[PDB]
């Protein structure tokens, strides 16, 4: 879906158009013999607020076989802290050793 | 004779005693130790540093080593390729000096 | 005397490199305790004899 | 009676996990685990290729 600069500018106030940013992190190093690239890539659209919130974990792959690749996330503790139930019903996390 | 003999008489005697003449493999033939501060693979110390070094020691053909190998194929595509520009005059080609 | 010669000669030139091949990894529970110490993880899939 | 509820078997929560995998990576050492544990940690890790 290619948004062109003309449209970003004239789109009706309603239309909520889909954009799509690159994942970038999982791209493998270019070769050591890849014909050098001459002209730079230009990018224009940026997101003014922090996108990717839906992101649970990301970059599940070894770096050089032990170091975590940069930008890799690993899931948050709270997303597997399955604790008891209250003295009622509401299910709450695990104490932190302080009740 | 029989030097090629590694072990021999693999079978119980009366169900516990080793039959006579039975051999059992030599320790050195499964002592797979490290590598030296170079490459030569040597036996395991005996708790007093440094070791035999298969080859630079006896003859016990050992059967287990630390072979280092390449993590994955080494000649996969992306063959180097240079662009070539030839001089454009073949008459103004220095050649001199040295 | 000569069987000995060409062979020293063969060893003389075994220009071959190695590539990890179809190794597998079993983890504890799958296999025995005894064998397990012996194994340090991801033993070559096409083992030998020893 | 009054059908004020539906008994379902294995419930389906609201949020889920959805993963996108670059499809060219794939550690080659193959990890095979106990046939039973391949059934607990079955989907989890599988989805998590």
């Amino acid at each position: 879906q290619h948004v062109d600069a003309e449209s970003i500018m004239t789109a009706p106030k309603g239309k909520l158009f889909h954009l799509q940013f690159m994942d970038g992190l999982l791209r493998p190093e270019p070769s050591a013999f890849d014909p050098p690239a001459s002209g730079e890539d230009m990018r224009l659209i940026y997101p003014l607020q922090p996108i990717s919130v839906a992101r649970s974990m990301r970059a599940i792959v070894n770096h050089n076989e032990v170091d975590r690749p940069r930008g890799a996330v690993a899931p948050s503790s709270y997303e597997m802290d399955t604790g008891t139930l209250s003295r009622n019903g509401d299910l709450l996390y695990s104490p932190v050793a302080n009740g | 004779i029989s030097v090629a003999r590694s072990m021999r008489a693999i079978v119980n005697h009366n169900e516990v005693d080793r039959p006579r003449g039975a051999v059992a493999p030599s320790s050195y033939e499964m002592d797979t130790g490290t590598l030296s501060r170079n490459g030569d693979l040597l036996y395991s110390p005996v708790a007093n540093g440094q070791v035999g070094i298969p080859k630079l020691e006896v003859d016990h053909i050992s059967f287990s080593n630390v072979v280092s190998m390449m993590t994955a194929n080494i000649r996969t595509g992306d063959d180097m390729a240079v662009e070539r520009v030839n001089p454009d005059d073949v008459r103004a080609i220095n050649i001199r000096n040295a | 005397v000569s069987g000995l010669l060409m062979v020293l000669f063969k060893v003389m030139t075994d220009n071959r490199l190695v590539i990890v091949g179809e190794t597998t990894t079993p983890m504890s529970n799958t296999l025995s305790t005894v064998v397990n110490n012996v194994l340090r993880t991801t033993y070559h899939n096409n083992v030998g004899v020893n | 009676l009054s059908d004020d509820f539906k008994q379902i078997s294995d419930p389906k929560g609201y949020l889920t996990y959805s993963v996108k995998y670059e499809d060219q990576f794939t550690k080659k050492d193959k990890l095979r685990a106990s046939e039973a544990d391949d059934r607990i940690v079955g989907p989890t890790v599988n989805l998590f290729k």
Binding site: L26, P28, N62 | - | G21 | -
Partner: peptide, 26 residues
């Protein structure tokens, strides 16, 4: 039956590296 003799040598397979199309590290 009449107690047979038997020999077996230790197998040997050295396929020549199967070039793969998958990296496995970023």
């Amino acid at each position: 039956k009449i107690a047979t003799a038997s020999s077996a040598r230790q197998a040997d397979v050295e396929k020549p590296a199967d070039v793969t199309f998958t990296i496995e590290n970023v």
